[PDB]
Write an enzyme that holds these catalytic residues in place. Structure first.
Site, short mmCIF file in Angstrom:
data_model
loop_
_atom_site.label_atom_id
_atom_site.label_comp_id
_atom_site.label_asym_id
_atom_site.label_seq_id
_atom_site.Cartn_x
_atom_site.Cartn_y
_atom_site.Cartn_z
N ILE A 187 0.96 -1.46 -0.06
CA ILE A 187 0.61 0.20 0.25
C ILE A 187 0.93 1.26 0.36
O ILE A 187 1.86 1.97 1.06
CB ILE A 187 -1.09 0.33 1.37
CG1 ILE A 187 -1.68 -1.51 1.62
CG2 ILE A 187 -1.87 1.53 0.88
CD1 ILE A 187 -2.51 -1.66 2.79
N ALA A 188 0.60 2.05 -0.36
CA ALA A 188 1.01 3.85 -1.05
C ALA A 188 -0.25 4.39 -2.00
O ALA A 188 -0.33 4.19 -2.45
CB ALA A 188 2.70 3.66 -1.55
N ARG A 189 -0.26 5.77 -0.95
CA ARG A 189 -1.06 6.37 -1.30
C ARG A 189 -0.74 7.32 -2.87
O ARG A 189 0.04 7.26 -3.68
CB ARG A 189 -1.44 7.81 -0.54
CG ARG A 189 -0.13 8.87 -1.05
CD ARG A 189 0.20 9.69 0.31
NE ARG A 189 0.59 11.19 0.10
CZ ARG A 189 1.16 11.77 0.92
NH1 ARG A 189 1.05 11.46 2.35
NH2 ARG A 189 1.30 13.30 0.67
N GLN A 216 10.93 1.63 0.97
CA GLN A 216 9.96 1.37 0.25
C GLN A 216 10.52 0.83 -0.74
O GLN A 216 10.70 0.61 -1.31
CB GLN A 216 9.23 1.96 0.19
CG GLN A 216 7.97 2.91 1.54
CD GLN A 216 7.99 2.12 3.11
OE1 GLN A 216 8.54 1.54 3.37
NE2 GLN A 216 6.29 2.21 3.23
N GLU A 240 5.37 -11.01 -1.30
CA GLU A 240 3.79 -11.45 -0.67
C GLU A 240 2.65 -12.20 -0.93
O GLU A 240 2.74 -12.99 -0.02
CB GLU A 240 3.56 -9.97 -0.55
CG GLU A 240 3.31 -8.38 0.36
CD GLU A 240 5.16 -7.87 -0.24
OE1 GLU A 240 5.27 -8.46 -1.42
OE2 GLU A 240 5.81 -6.86 0.67
N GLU A 277 -2.75 12.90 6.48
CA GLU A 277 -1.70 11.83 7.55
C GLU A 277 -2.24 10.77 8.54
O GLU A 277 -2.59 11.00 9.35
CB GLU A 277 -0.66 12.32 6.44
CG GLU A 277 0.17 12.66 5.53
CD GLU A 277 1.59 13.17 5.60
OE1 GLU A 277 1.74 13.91 6.46
OE2 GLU A 277 1.44 13.23 4.50
C1 FMN Z 1 -4.04 2.40 4.91
C2 FMN Z 1 -3.30 2.71 4.61
C3 FMN Z 1 -2.04 3.73 4.10
C4 FMN Z 1 -0.37 3.79 4.24
N1 FMN Z 1 -0.10 5.02 3.18
C5 FMN Z 1 1.33 4.34 3.05
C6 FMN Z 1 1.86 5.35 2.10
O1 FMN Z 1 1.28 6.88 1.77
N2 FMN Z 1 3.47 4.77 1.80
C7 FMN Z 1 3.55 4.35 2.12
O2 FMN Z 1 4.78 4.44 1.40
N3 FMN Z 1 3.34 3.29 2.84
C8 FMN Z 1 2.24 3.62 3.10
N4 FMN Z 1 1.59 2.37 3.60
C9 FMN Z 1 1.80 1.58 5.06
C10 FMN Z 1 3.13 0.32 4.09
O3 FMN Z 1 2.11 -0.35 3.54
C11 FMN Z 1 3.96 -0.75 4.95
O4 FMN Z 1 5.14 0.30 5.29
C12 FMN Z 1 4.28 -1.58 4.62
O5 FMN Z 1 5.10 -2.59 4.92
C13 FMN Z 1 5.23 -1.03 2.65
O6 FMN Z 1 5.27 -2.83 1.89
P1 FMN Z 1 6.49 -2.79 1.36
O7 FMN Z 1 7.11 -3.76 2.39
O8 FMN Z 1 6.63 -4.13 0.89
O9 FMN Z 1 7.50 -1.82 1.37
C14 FMN Z 1 0.18 2.37 4.04
C15 FMN Z 1 -0.43 0.87 4.54
C16 FMN Z 1 -1.86 1.33 5.46
C17 FMN Z 1 -2.59 0.35 5.80
O1 ICB Z 2 2.99 9.26 2.18
C1 ICB Z 2 2.35 9.04 2.85
O2 ICB Z 2 1.24 9.01 3.67
C2 ICB Z 2 2.64 7.62 3.61
C3 ICB Z 2 4.16 7.41 3.85
C4 ICB Z 2 4.28 6.08 4.16
C5 ICB Z 2 5.41 5.08 4.60
C6 ICB Z 2 5.29 4.29 5.98
C7 ICB Z 2 4.14 4.31 5.71
C8 ICB Z 2 3.36 5.29 5.77
C9 ICB Z 2 3.28 6.12 5.57
N1 ICB Z 2 2.31 7.05 4.73
K K Z 3 4.81 -5.57 1.91
MN MN Z 4 7.58 -6.07 0.26
#
Ligand code: FMN
Ligand code: ICB
Ligand code: K
Ligand code: MN
Ligand code: FMN
Ligand code: ICB
Ligand code: K
Ligand code: K
Ligand code: K
Ligand code: MN
Lengths: 497, 497
Positions: free
Chosen positions: B169-171, B188, B231, B280
C-alpha cells in the site's frame, strides 16, 4: 449543621445525597480488607466506601471513609467529589476547580476565628487511656512497613516566631502506643518548619494532626501555596468565610472545630524511627525498603462522637494522590508561570503520566510577540518551574499550543508524540531537585534527589513565528461546518450509534 | 462463493453478518461526505460504512467501503475486522493476529496459481473509455491536494529480473484523465524496485494497482516483510492456500482473480507531478504543502460487476494507518529482535503514541543471564531496529519487563512514566533514517529524513541483576488471593457496580 465544604460530617452526607456513597454496616477488617475495597473503588471509579463497622473500633474510634477525593464513573460529574470539597456544582470542570483553588492567591487572607469548643471536643483520651496499636488503623497494602493512620489528615505546625502556621498532608504510620513515624522531606513546608525548630534547638515542635477536617482545608493542605502563607487564611479567602478553630488541650495550636479526630503532641527535633515502606502515588511498593523517619509523640486524642477517619488507598490510577497532588501542583505551576511573564493559559498533570508530567498550554499569540526560539523558551520555562517548590513532584513539562486541551490526556499524548522531536526539541535539567518517590529516581540508575527532569517542546516551529500552519485530520477540522452538521443530523437515520 | 479472507466481496458480507456494516443506499457525495462519515466512524469505533449510492458512480464504478480495518466498540471483538481479514475468530487477540501475520516467516512460500479468468475481468475500459476525473474518487480531507483514489489498494511491481514481485500500500491521487501521482519513498519496496528500473534505464515500470484484493493479501501489503520476498507466496503460506491470480490484459503482471478494481499501466522512471498535501496517519494536513510525486500512467481498468472501492479516511485515532501500519511494523520488529538474539517476547505500537512508539516486552530471566547494562542493551536494541526498514516508522522504543502487557497502552504509559529516567535511561539516535511524515520531522526543527529516534529503557535496575524488587500498589498485587476473591464475591451484595 454546617456546609459540606466546611464540615467533613456534612461532606459525607453530601456524598450519600449524591448517590456517591456505599455504607458498609457489616464487619470489615482494617487489616487490608477496607483498603482493598477502597483500592478496587479507585481503580473502577465507583462510589466511595464508608466502613461503619470496622473490626477493632472501640469507644467511637473509628469508622473509615475511603476514596474521599477519587473519581466518579460519569464524565459529566467526573470530578464531583472534588467539587464537593469546595461548594462547587458537582459538574464543575477541572479548570473551574483549579481556578477556585487559585482564587485566594490575589485576595487578602481571611484569618481564622477562635471559638471556645466544637464537635472535635466531644470525647478525649489522655496519655493513660489510648494506645495507637489498639485502634483500628489500616494496613493499606500487604507489604507496608506499618499501619498508616495518616493518609488524609492535616498536620499543623507553626514557625518558632508564630508568624506562619502550615497545614499539609504527609504520611505517617503507628510506631508504638504513643508515637508515629513519617516522611518529613525537603522542600515541604512541614520540613522547612521542622528545620527552623532544629536550628533554634530548644524544644520539640508543637504539633497536631487533624483528620476529617473541613474539605476546603484538606484541599489547600494538598496544594503548594507559597512559603510563609498560613493555609487557614487562604482557605478563609477562597471560601469567603473565616474558619472556626478551637485550641488544642495540651498545646497552643488551633484545630478546625469540626475535626473528626485530633492527635496532639510533638514532632521531635532529635528522634527517628523505622518508616515505610509504603505503597505510593506512582503505583509501587519496594518491600523491605525501610528507612528512618521523623518521630511524632502523641499526648492526647480528641474526637467527635462516631468519628470517621478518611483514608487514601493510594497506588495505581486513580486516587487522591493523582487527583489532588497532580492537579493542585499544576494549578500553582500555572500561576507561577504567569507571574514570571510566561504566556501560559492552563496547566494539568496528565493521569496517564502517573502525574509526573505537567502539560502547559501556551497563548501562542503572546509567544509570537516574544520573538524567541524553542531552545530559549524551554530553558526559561524549566528554570522557573524546576527551581521552585511547586515543580518538585513534576519531572516532565510538555509545552503545547492553543489547540490542545491540557485537561484531555489523549490530546496531550497526541501532541507530545507528534510535535516534540526526541532530544532536539527537549532540554534536560540535571542540577535541580528531583522527586525521589518516582521509582526511576529513588530506585533508579542515578542520584535519587537530583536531576532527571526535562522540558519537552510540543510547539511546532511556526507557532513561534507566523502561526499554526496545519489543520487536524479529524472530523472537527477536516470538514466544513455545514457538512459536519449534516452528518451529525443524519447519523442515527443512516444506522450508526 | 469463496472465504472472507480470500475474497473481498465475501469479507463485506462477513461484516454484514457480524452486524458490523451500515449500508447507505441514499446518495452520498464522494466530495468529503463519504470520508466525513468514515472519519466519524473511525473516531467512535462504529460499524463500517458501505456507500452503495455514490454521486458520480457510472457503469459500475464504484461503491465505497470505509473503515475496512478499523476498531469495533466492544473490547471482546475490538480487533474483529482484522480477524476477518485472516480467518481468525472475531474475538482474536492482537497477539494472535500478529502471530498469524508472522507465521509464514518460517514456512516455505506457497506460490500463487494462475487461472485464466476471474471476477475482476467482468468489465473493462480501455484508454478511450475511461477518465479518472469522471469517476467518484473521494476528496478525503477538505485541504487535500487531490482526490485520493488510492488509500487501501495494492500496488504490484516486479524487479527487472522477474525474481521478486512486491505487493504494498502507498497512497496515490488522480492527476488527470489517465494518470495518478503518489508517494514512492525510501526505504519502501515500491521505491527499491523503482530504483532498479531507473538504474536499468530502458523502460517505465510495468505496474498494476488492485483494489478490494483478498483481505489476507492487503494485510501482508501493509507489513514490512523482508526485502526480496514475494508477498503472494507469504500470504499463500500464512493462509495454507495458493492464491489465484489472473494476468493483466496490457502487461504480464498477475492480479488477484477476485480484485474489485484493477488499474493497469506504468510507474514512470522519469516523470513527476504535483502530489499532496494529504491528511496523514499522525493526524495532520499542512495545506498548500504540495511536492513532486511519482507519476503513474493508467492504460486499462478492469472491474467486478457492482465493484466496491475500499477507502481509509485516515488521520486521528483510530484507522487502518494505526491498526495495521503500527501493529504490523511492531510484529516484524518483534521477530527482528528475536532473530538478533535479543530477549524480546512481544511488541506493539501504542495507539496513544500515534503509533510512533513501539513497546518491547523483555524476558528478564534471559536479560539477567546476559549480564549487561541499560546503556549497552539500549544501544544494541536501537542499532538492530533503527538500522532496519521494519523500524522506519518508529521513533521511540520503550523497553519494559515481563509484568507489562504491551498491548495495553495504559500499562505502557505507566511503565514509561515511572521506570525510565529522562535522559539518563535513554539513548538518542541521530544517524539513522527518520520518518519525515511525523510533523516533528518533516515540519520540525531538524533534518526531515535523519535522526530524532530514541530508546527509552523502562526496565528497572534489578531487572538486569537479581530480579524485580517491587510489587504494584494495585488491587491485583497488594492483597492476598483469598482477600481479593472475598472482595470480588461480595462486591454487588455490599452495593458497588
Ligand atoms: C491505510 C494505509 C496507508 C498507507 N499509506 C502509505 C503511503 O502512502 N506510503 C507508503 O510507503 N506506505 C504506506 N503505507 C504503509 C506500507 O503499506 C507499509 O510500510 C508496507 O510495509 C509497505 O510494503 P513493503 O514492505 O512491501 O514496502 C500505508 C498502509 C496503510 C494500511
Ligand atoms: O506518503 C504517505 O502518506 C505515507 C508514506 C508512508 C510510509 C510508511 C508508512 C506510512 C506512510 N504514509
Ligand atoms: K508489504
Ligand atoms: Mn515487500
Ligand atoms: C493523599 C495524599 C498523600 C500525600 N502524602 C504525602 C507525603 O507522604 N509526604 C508529603 O510531603 N506530601 C504528601 N502529599 C502532598 C502534599 O500534601 C503537598 O505536596 C502539599 O503541597 C504539602 O503542603 P505544603 O505546600 O504546605 O508543604 C500528599 C497529598 C495527598 C493528597
Ligand atoms: O513519603 C511519601 O509517600 C510522599 C512524599 C511526598 C512528597 C510530595 C508529594 C507526595 C509525596 N508522597
Ligand atoms: K499546603
Ligand atoms: K517541537
Ligand atoms: K530505567
Ligand atoms: Mn504550606
Amino acid at each position: 449543621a454546617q456546609p459540606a465544604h466546611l464540615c467533613f460530617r456534612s461532606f459525607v452526607e453530601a456524598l450519600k445525597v449524591d448517590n456517591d456513597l456505599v455504607e458498609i454496616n457489616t464487619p470489615i477488617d482494617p487489616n487490608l480488607e477496607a483498603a482493598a475495597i477502597t483500592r478496587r473503588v479507585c481503580e473502577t471509579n465507583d462510589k466511595a466506601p464508608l466502613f461503619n463497622n470496622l473490626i477493632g473500633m472501640k469507644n467511637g474510634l473509628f469508622r473509615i471513609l475511603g476514596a474521599p477525593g477519587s473519581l466518579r464513573k460519569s464524565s459529566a460529574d467526573r470530578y464531583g467529589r472534588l467539587a464537593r470539597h469546595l461548594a462547587l456544582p458537582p459538574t464543575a470542570s477541572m479548570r473551574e476547580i483549579l481556578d477556585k483553588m487559585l482564587s485566594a492567591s490575589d485576595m487578602p487572607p481571611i484569618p481564622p476565628t477562635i471559638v471556645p469548643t466544637g464537635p472535635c471536643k466531644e470525647n478525649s483520651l489522655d496519655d493513660s487511656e489510648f494506645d495507637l496499636t489498639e485502634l483500628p488503623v489500616p494496613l493499606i497494602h500487604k507489604s507496608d512497613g506499618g499501619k498508616y493512620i495518616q493518609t488524609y489528615g492535616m498536620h499543623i505546625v507553626q514557625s518558632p516566631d508564630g508568624t506562619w502556621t502550615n497545614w499539609s498532608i504527609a504520611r505517617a504510620m503507628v510506631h508504638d502506643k504513643n508515637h508515629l513515624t513519617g516522611l518529613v522531606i525537603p522542600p515541604q513546608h512541614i520540613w522547612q518548619i521542622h528545620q527552623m525548630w532544629k536550628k533554634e534547638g530548644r524544644s520539640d515542635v508543637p504539633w497536631a494532626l487533624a483528620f476529617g477536617v473541613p474539605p476546603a482545608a484538606i484541599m489547600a493542605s494538598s496544594m503548594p501555596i507559597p512559603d510563609g502563607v498560613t493555609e487557614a487564611g487562604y482557605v478563609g479567602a477562597m471560601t469567603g468565610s473565616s474558619l472556626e478553630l478551637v485550641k488544642c488541650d495540651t498545646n497552643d495550636l488551633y484545630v478546625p472545630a469540626t475535626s473528626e479526630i485530633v492527635l496532639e503532641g510533638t514532632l521531635s527535633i532529635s528522634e527517628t524511627g523505622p518508616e515505610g515502606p509504603f505503597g505510593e502515588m506512582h503505583g509501587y511498593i519496594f518491600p523491605g525498603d525501610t528507612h528512618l523517619g521523623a518521630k511524632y509523640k502523641v499526648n492526647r486524642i480528641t474526637y467527635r462522637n462516631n468519628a470517621i477517619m478518611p483514608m487514601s488507598s493510594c497506588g495505581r490510577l486513580t486516587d487522591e494522590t493523582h487527583t489532588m497532588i497532580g492537579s493542585l501542583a499544576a494549578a500553582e505551576i500555572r500561576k507561577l508561570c504567569q507571574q514570571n511573564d510566561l504566556p501560559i493559559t492552563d496547566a494539568f498533570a496528565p493521569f496517564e503520566s502517573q502525574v509526573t508530567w505537567v502539560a502547559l498550554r501556551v497563548d501562542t499569540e503572546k509567544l509570537r510577540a516574544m520573538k524567541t526560539t524553542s531552545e530559549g523558551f524551554r530553558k526559561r520555562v524549566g528554570d522557573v518551574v524546576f527551581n521552585h517548590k511547586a515543580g518538585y513532584t513534576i519531572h516532565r513539562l510538555v509545552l503545547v499550543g492553543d489547540d490542545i486541551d491540557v485537561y484531555e490526556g489523549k490530546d496531550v499524548l497526541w501532541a507530545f508524540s507528534t510535535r516534540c522531536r526526541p532530544g532536539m526539541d527537549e532540554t534536560l535539567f540535571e542540577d535541580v531537585r528531583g522527586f525521589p518517590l518516582i521509582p526511576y529516581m529513588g530506585h533508579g540508575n542515578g542520584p535519587a534527589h537530583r536531576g532527571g527532569k526535562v522540558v519537552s517542546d510540543a510547539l511546532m516551529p511556526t507557532e513561534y513565528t507566523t502561526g499554526r500552519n496545519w489543520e487536524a485530520a479529524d472530523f472537527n477540522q477536516s470538514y466544513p461546518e455545514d457538512l459536519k452538521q449534516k452528518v451529525l443530523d443524519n447519523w442515527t437515520k443512516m444506522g450508526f450509534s
